[PDB]
Amino acid sequence: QPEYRIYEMNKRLQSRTEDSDNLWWDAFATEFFEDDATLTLSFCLEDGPKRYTIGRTQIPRYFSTVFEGGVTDLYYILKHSKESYHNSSITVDCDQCAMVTQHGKPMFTKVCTEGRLILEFTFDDLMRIKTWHFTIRQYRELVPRSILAMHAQDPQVLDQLSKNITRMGLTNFTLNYL
Amino acid sequence: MVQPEYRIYEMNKRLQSRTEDSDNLWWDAFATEFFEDDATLTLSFCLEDGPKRYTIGRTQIPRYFSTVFEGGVTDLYYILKHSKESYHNSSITVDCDQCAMVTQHGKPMFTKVCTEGRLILEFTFDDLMRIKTWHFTIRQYRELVPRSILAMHAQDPQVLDQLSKNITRMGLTNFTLNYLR
């Protein structure tokens, strides 16, 4: 099953320690991405609609940068994923995907980066990703109710709690690298 | 030749593949597809002054998941981080001490409820791997509020006081406990 590979990846991301070197991320990409894999992200920030694409050797560094900002966990939620097979390719079209990154101290903010995700899988036993396209539409940010009690209390320092920490779902550490 | 916790993902896949008017026949087909005909579901927590353990059988399991969405909840999925499995001759047990039952509510505030706790599941070691025992011990629960609600409803500290007062009780909503008791 294709999404079973996506689940196996969700468990491996949870085995990521705060001391995961580049050697661990390379083993992470080699386990799910083909040697010729490419990753594409599309968003609409502010200078005009953009589109970036990285290669196989730049993929392990991409998933490394998402955690380089207080992010403790990363998993993908796939609502209503439409598959489509070929003779030697498996395409997974999920229009309701949410890249969830859970942050840590000081405010355990949860970010739900929603958008469309397309994946082309190889029809082998490794069944690794050959193409990763994630089109971003929106991002939903949530703050634990505990933080709204100790921090903010009520009317004050709401500008930190009313202003977003991420940009179009992705943090401020994954744009200068792109 | 397949890992048991994959059943939780296959279960998570159908919970979101649910319509707004799901009859009980669809929930019964959902239960027979993941639970044995003699399955049992257990919830353990420490609410009042002491332990409260509940247990229902196969015929009431699909109705338990019906109560989750009838409290304004629009989505429900389970996260199993650091899951310890266990194979035997005719049983497969999955012990996940760090599980989060995530329930997303709807209007007006769109609160996300993370009912966290220890989860144990006993799977049958046959060619279906359906659940025989579901025991979910609850330890904590966190509620998360969208920053958008805190932006427009930012003013006026009384919503900011209600945004610090929880809507659920120990993770489960006010509609799935009157049915449990």
Coordinates of C-alpha atoms in Angstrom, one line a residue:
Chain A
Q1 CA 0.0 0.0 0.0
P2 CA 1.4 3.5 -0.9
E3 CA 0.2 5.4 2.2
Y4 CA 1.6 2.6 4.3
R5 CA 5.0 4.0 3.2
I6 CA 3.7 7.4 4.3
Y7 CA 2.8 5.9 7.7
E8 CA 6.2 4.1 8.0
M9 CA 7.6 7.6 7.5
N10 CA 5.4 9.1 10.2
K11 CA 6.9 6.6 12.7
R12 CA 10.4 7.2 11.5
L13 CA 10.1 11.0 12.0
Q14 CA 9.1 10.3 15.6
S15 CA 12.4 8.5 16.1
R16 CA 14.2 11.8 15.3
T17 CA 16.1 13.0 18.3
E18 CA 17.2 16.6 18.9
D19 CA 20.7 15.2 18.1
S20 CA 20.0 13.7 14.7
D21 CA 23.1 14.5 12.5
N22 CA 23.1 14.6 8.7
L23 CA 24.0 10.9 8.8
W24 CA 20.6 10.1 10.2
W25 CA 18.7 12.3 7.8
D26 CA 20.5 10.7 4.8
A27 CA 19.4 7.3 6.0
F28 CA 15.9 8.7 6.3
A29 CA 15.8 9.8 2.7
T30 CA 17.5 6.7 1.4
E31 CA 14.7 4.7 3.0
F32 CA 11.8 6.5 1.4
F33 CA 13.3 8.4 -1.6
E34 CA 14.8 7.1 -4.8
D35 CA 18.3 8.2 -5.8
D36 CA 16.7 10.5 -8.4
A37 CA 14.0 11.9 -6.2
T38 CA 12.9 15.5 -6.4
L39 CA 10.9 17.6 -3.9
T40 CA 8.7 20.5 -5.0
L41 CA 6.9 23.1 -2.9
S42 CA 4.5 25.7 -4.3
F43 CA 3.2 28.6 -2.3
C44 CA 1.9 32.2 -2.6
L45 CA 4.0 34.4 -0.2
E46 CA 4.3 38.0 -1.3
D47 CA 6.8 38.7 -4.1
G48 CA 4.5 36.7 -6.5
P49 CA 3.5 33.0 -6.7
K50 CA 6.7 30.9 -6.4
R51 CA 7.8 27.4 -7.0
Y52 CA 11.0 25.7 -5.7
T53 CA 12.5 22.3 -6.5
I54 CA 15.3 20.4 -4.8
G55 CA 17.1 17.2 -5.7
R56 CA 18.0 13.9 -3.9
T57 CA 21.0 15.2 -2.1
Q58 CA 19.1 18.3 -1.0
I59 CA 16.1 16.4 0.4
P60 CA 17.7 15.2 3.7
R61 CA 18.6 18.8 4.4
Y62 CA 15.0 19.9 3.7
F63 CA 13.4 17.7 6.4
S64 CA 16.3 18.7 8.7
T65 CA 15.5 22.4 8.4
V66 CA 11.9 22.0 9.5
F67 CA 13.0 20.8 13.0
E68 CA 15.7 23.6 13.2
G69 CA 13.4 26.0 15.0
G70 CA 12.0 24.5 18.2
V71 CA 9.9 22.0 16.3
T72 CA 9.6 18.7 18.2
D73 CA 7.4 16.6 15.9
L74 CA 6.4 16.3 12.3
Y75 CA 3.7 14.1 10.8
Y76 CA 1.4 14.1 7.7
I77 CA -2.3 13.7 7.9
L78 CA -3.8 12.5 4.6
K79 CA -7.6 13.1 4.3
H80 CA -9.3 11.7 1.2
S81 CA -6.2 10.6 -0.7
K82 CA -6.9 9.7 -4.3
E83 CA -4.5 7.1 -5.7
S84 CA -3.8 6.2 -9.3
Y85 CA -1.4 3.5 -10.5
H86 CA 0.5 2.9 -13.7
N87 CA 2.6 0.1 -15.0
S88 CA 5.8 1.3 -13.3
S89 CA 4.5 4.3 -11.2
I90 CA 2.1 4.9 -8.4
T91 CA 0.6 8.4 -8.0
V92 CA -1.0 9.4 -4.7
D93 CA -3.2 12.6 -5.0
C94 CA -4.2 13.9 -1.6
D95 CA -6.2 17.2 -1.8
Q96 CA -6.6 17.4 2.0
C97 CA -3.1 17.0 3.4
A98 CA -1.9 18.8 6.5
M99 CA 1.8 19.1 7.4
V100 CA 1.7 19.3 11.2
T101 CA 4.7 20.6 13.1
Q102 CA 4.5 20.7 16.9
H103 CA 6.7 23.4 18.5
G104 CA 8.3 23.4 22.0
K105 CA 9.1 26.1 24.5
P106 CA 8.2 28.8 25.1
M107 CA 4.7 28.5 23.4
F108 CA 3.9 24.9 22.3
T109 CA 2.3 26.2 19.1
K110 CA 0.9 23.6 16.7
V111 CA 0.9 24.5 13.1
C112 CA -1.4 22.8 10.6
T113 CA 0.0 23.5 7.1
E114 CA -2.8 22.4 4.8
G115 CA -2.6 21.9 1.0
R116 CA -2.5 19.5 -1.8
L117 CA 0.2 16.8 -1.9
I118 CA 1.1 14.7 -4.9
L119 CA 3.5 11.8 -4.7
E120 CA 4.8 9.5 -7.5
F121 CA 5.9 6.2 -6.2
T122 CA 8.0 3.5 -7.9
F123 CA 6.3 0.2 -8.4
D124 CA 9.2 -1.8 -6.9
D125 CA 9.7 -3.5 -3.5
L126 CA 11.4 -0.4 -2.1
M127 CA 8.5 1.7 -3.4
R128 CA 10.3 4.9 -2.7
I129 CA 9.2 8.5 -3.6
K130 CA 10.4 9.8 -6.9
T131 CA 8.4 13.1 -7.0
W132 CA 7.2 15.1 -4.0
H133 CA 4.9 18.1 -4.9
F134 CA 3.1 19.9 -2.0
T135 CA 1.0 22.9 -3.0
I136 CA 0.2 25.1 0.0
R137 CA -3.2 26.8 0.2
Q138 CA -3.3 27.9 3.9
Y139 CA -1.9 27.2 7.4
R140 CA -3.8 26.9 10.6
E141 CA -2.0 27.7 13.9
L142 CA -3.2 26.5 17.3
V143 CA -2.1 27.4 20.8
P144 CA -2.7 25.1 23.8
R145 CA -5.2 26.5 26.3
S146 CA -2.6 26.1 29.0
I147 CA -0.4 28.7 27.4
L148 CA -3.3 31.1 27.2
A149 CA -3.6 30.8 31.0
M150 CA -0.1 31.3 32.3
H151 CA 1.1 33.3 29.3
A152 CA -1.0 36.2 28.2
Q153 CA -3.2 35.8 31.2
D154 CA -5.9 37.8 29.5
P155 CA -5.5 41.1 27.7
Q156 CA -1.7 41.5 27.5
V157 CA 1.2 40.2 25.3
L158 CA -1.6 39.1 22.8
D159 CA 0.5 40.5 19.9
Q160 CA 2.8 37.5 20.3
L161 CA -0.3 35.3 20.6
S162 CA -2.1 37.1 17.7
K163 CA 0.8 37.2 15.3
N164 CA 1.9 34.0 13.6
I165 CA 5.3 32.5 14.1
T166 CA 5.5 30.6 10.7
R167 CA 5.1 31.9 7.2
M168 CA 2.6 30.1 4.9
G169 CA 3.0 27.0 7.1
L170 CA 6.8 26.8 6.8
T171 CA 9.0 28.4 9.5
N172 CA 11.5 31.2 9.2
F173 CA 14.4 28.7 9.0
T174 CA 13.2 26.9 5.8
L175 CA 13.1 29.9 3.4
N176 CA 16.7 31.3 3.3
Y177 CA 17.8 27.7 2.6
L178 CA 15.3 27.2 -0.2
Chain B
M1 CA 3.3 -10.2 6.8
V2 CA 2.2 -6.7 8.0
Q3 CA 2.7 -4.6 11.0
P4 CA -0.2 -4.2 13.5
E5 CA -0.1 -0.5 14.1
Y6 CA -0.8 -0.1 10.4
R7 CA -4.4 -1.0 11.3
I8 CA -4.6 2.2 13.3
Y9 CA -3.8 4.1 10.1
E10 CA -6.3 2.1 8.1
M11 CA -8.8 3.0 10.8
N12 CA -7.7 6.6 10.8
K13 CA -8.3 6.6 7.0
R14 CA -12.0 5.7 7.3
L15 CA -12.8 7.9 10.3
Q16 CA -12.0 10.9 8.1
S17 CA -13.9 9.2 5.2
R18 CA -17.1 9.8 7.1
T19 CA -20.2 11.7 6.0
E20 CA -22.1 14.2 8.2
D21 CA -25.1 11.9 8.4
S22 CA -23.5 8.5 9.0
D23 CA -26.1 5.9 9.9
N24 CA -25.4 3.1 12.3
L25 CA -25.1 0.5 9.5
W26 CA -22.0 2.3 8.3
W27 CA -20.5 2.3 11.8
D28 CA -21.4 -1.4 12.2
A29 CA -19.5 -2.1 9.0
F30 CA -16.7 -0.1 10.4
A31 CA -16.6 -2.1 13.6
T32 CA -16.9 -5.6 12.0
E33 CA -14.0 -4.6 9.7
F34 CA -11.5 -3.7 12.6
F35 CA -13.0 -5.5 15.6
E36 CA -13.6 -9.2 16.3
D37 CA -17.2 -10.3 16.9
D38 CA -16.2 -10.7 20.6
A39 CA -14.2 -7.5 20.9
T40 CA -14.1 -5.4 24.1
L41 CA -13.4 -1.7 24.5
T42 CA -12.1 -0.3 27.7
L43 CA -11.5 3.3 28.9
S44 CA -9.5 3.9 32.1
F45 CA -9.0 7.3 33.8
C46 CA -8.8 9.0 37.2
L47 CA -11.4 11.7 37.2
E48 CA -13.4 12.0 40.4
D49 CA -11.4 11.1 43.5
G50 CA -10.3 7.7 42.0
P51 CA -10.1 5.3 39.1
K52 CA -12.9 5.0 36.6
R53 CA -12.7 2.0 34.2
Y54 CA -15.4 1.4 31.7
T55 CA -15.8 -1.5 29.3
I56 CA -18.2 -2.1 26.4
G57 CA -18.7 -5.0 24.0
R58 CA -18.7 -5.6 20.3
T59 CA -22.3 -4.5 19.8
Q60 CA -21.7 -1.1 21.5
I61 CA -18.3 -0.3 20.0
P62 CA -19.6 1.4 16.8
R63 CA -22.0 3.4 18.9
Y64 CA -19.1 4.7 21.0
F65 CA -17.4 6.2 17.9
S66 CA -20.8 7.7 16.9
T67 CA -20.9 9.7 20.2
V68 CA -17.5 11.4 19.4
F69 CA -18.8 13.2 16.3
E70 CA -22.2 14.1 17.8
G71 CA -20.6 16.7 20.1
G72 CA -19.8 19.1 17.3
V73 CA -16.7 17.1 16.4
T74 CA -15.9 17.1 12.7
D75 CA -12.8 14.9 12.7
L76 CA -11.2 12.1 14.8
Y77 CA -7.8 10.4 14.4
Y78 CA -5.3 8.6 16.6
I79 CA -1.5 9.2 16.9
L80 CA 0.6 6.3 18.0
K81 CA 4.1 7.6 18.7
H82 CA 6.6 5.0 20.2
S83 CA 4.4 2.0 19.8
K84 CA 5.6 -1.3 21.3
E85 CA 4.1 -4.3 19.6
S86 CA 4.2 -8.0 20.7
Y87 CA 3.8 -11.2 18.8
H88 CA 2.5 -14.5 20.2
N89 CA 0.9 -17.7 18.9
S90 CA -2.6 -16.3 18.5
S91 CA -2.4 -12.7 19.8
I92 CA -0.7 -9.4 18.8
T93 CA -0.6 -6.7 21.5
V94 CA 0.3 -3.1 20.8
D95 CA 1.4 -1.0 23.8
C96 CA 1.6 2.7 23.0
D97 CA 2.1 4.7 26.2
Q98 CA 2.3 8.0 24.2
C99 CA -1.0 8.1 22.3
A100 CA -3.1 11.1 21.5
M101 CA -6.8 10.9 20.6
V102 CA -7.2 14.0 18.5
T103 CA -10.8 15.3 18.0
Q104 CA -11.5 18.5 15.9
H105 CA -14.6 20.4 16.7
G106 CA -16.6 22.7 14.5
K107 CA -18.2 26.1 14.9
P108 CA -17.9 28.6 16.6
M109 CA -14.4 28.2 18.0
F110 CA -13.0 25.1 16.1
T111 CA -11.1 23.6 19.1
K112 CA -8.8 20.7 18.8
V113 CA -8.9 18.2 21.7
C114 CA -5.8 16.0 22.3
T115 CA -6.9 13.2 24.7
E116 CA -3.5 11.8 25.6
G117 CA -2.8 8.6 27.5
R118 CA -1.7 5.0 27.3
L119 CA -3.2 2.7 24.7
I120 CA -3.2 -1.1 24.6
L121 CA -4.7 -3.1 21.8
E122 CA -4.9 -6.9 21.3
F123 CA -5.0 -8.0 17.7
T124 CA -5.8 -11.5 16.5
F125 CA -3.0 -13.3 14.8
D126 CA -5.1 -14.5 11.8
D127 CA -5.3 -13.2 8.3
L128 CA -7.3 -10.1 9.2
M129 CA -5.7 -8.8 12.4
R130 CA -8.9 -7.4 13.9
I131 CA -9.0 -6.0 17.4
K132 CA -9.9 -8.2 20.3
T133 CA -9.3 -5.8 23.2
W134 CA -9.2 -2.0 23.2
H135 CA -7.9 -0.5 26.5
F136 CA -7.2 3.2 26.5
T137 CA -6.0 4.6 29.8
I138 CA -6.2 8.4 29.8
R139 CA -3.5 10.5 31.6
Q140 CA -3.9 14.1 30.4
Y141 CA -5.8 16.2 27.8
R142 CA -4.8 19.4 26.0
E143 CA -7.1 21.8 24.1
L144 CA -5.8 24.0 21.4
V145 CA -7.5 27.2 20.1
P146 CA -6.8 28.7 16.6
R147 CA -4.9 31.9 16.7
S148 CA -7.5 33.3 14.3
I149 CA -10.2 33.0 17.0
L150 CA -7.7 34.7 19.3
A151 CA -7.2 37.5 16.7
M152 CA -10.8 38.6 15.9
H153 CA -12.0 37.6 19.4
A154 CA -8.7 39.0 20.7
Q155 CA -10.3 41.9 22.5
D156 CA -12.5 41.5 25.6
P157 CA -10.8 39.4 28.2
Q158 CA -13.9 37.3 29.0
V159 CA -13.6 35.3 25.8
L160 CA -9.9 35.1 26.7
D161 CA -11.1 33.7 30.0
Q162 CA -13.4 31.2 28.2
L163 CA -10.4 30.5 25.9
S164 CA -8.7 29.4 29.1
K165 CA -11.7 27.3 30.3
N166 CA -12.0 23.9 28.7
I167 CA -15.0 22.6 26.8
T168 CA -14.3 18.9 27.4
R169 CA -13.8 16.8 30.6
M170 CA -10.7 14.7 30.7
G171 CA -10.5 14.6 26.9
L172 CA -13.9 13.2 26.1
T173 CA -16.7 15.6 25.2
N174 CA -19.9 16.3 27.1
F175 CA -21.7 13.8 24.9
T176 CA -19.6 10.6 25.1
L177 CA -19.7 10.3 29.0
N178 CA -23.4 10.3 29.6
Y179 CA -23.4 7.3 27.3
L180 CA -20.5 5.7 29.0
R181 CA -21.9 6.1 32.6

